[PDB]
Amino acid sequence: IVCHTTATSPISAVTCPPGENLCYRKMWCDAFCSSRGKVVELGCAATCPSKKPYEEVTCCSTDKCNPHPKQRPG
């Protein structure tokens, strides 16, 4: 499967060769609670854990199914 990520210059996107092809959408509070905004990290996992600790996480298993919310309809 395909997958997005947040790491290089712009948004990164690669395919997950192993069994872990799930695209998670992690998001917590980084300045939106303070001043700037909520944090967002796009990645590829196999055992998408629970975001209960103190954040969010959308576990999906489709080609680059981890797109951005505020960033997309530019």
């Binding site: 990520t5 947040t6 790491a7 290089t8 210059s9 712009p10 948004i11 990164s12 998001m27 980084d30 300045a31 939106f32 700037r36 905004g37 909520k38 944090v39 967002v40 990290e41 796009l42 951005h68 919310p69 505020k70 960033q71 530019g74």
Partner: peptide, 25 residues
């Protein structure tokens, strides 16, 4: 010329205020 690895920080709220991280010695 340099180019590092992969480091980002995308904040929900604003698209014109992206936090990019590539290289900075």
């Amino acid at each position: 010329e340099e180019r590092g690895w992969k480091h980002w920080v995308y904040y929900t709220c604003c698209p014109d205020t992206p936090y990019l991280d590539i290289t900075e010695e």
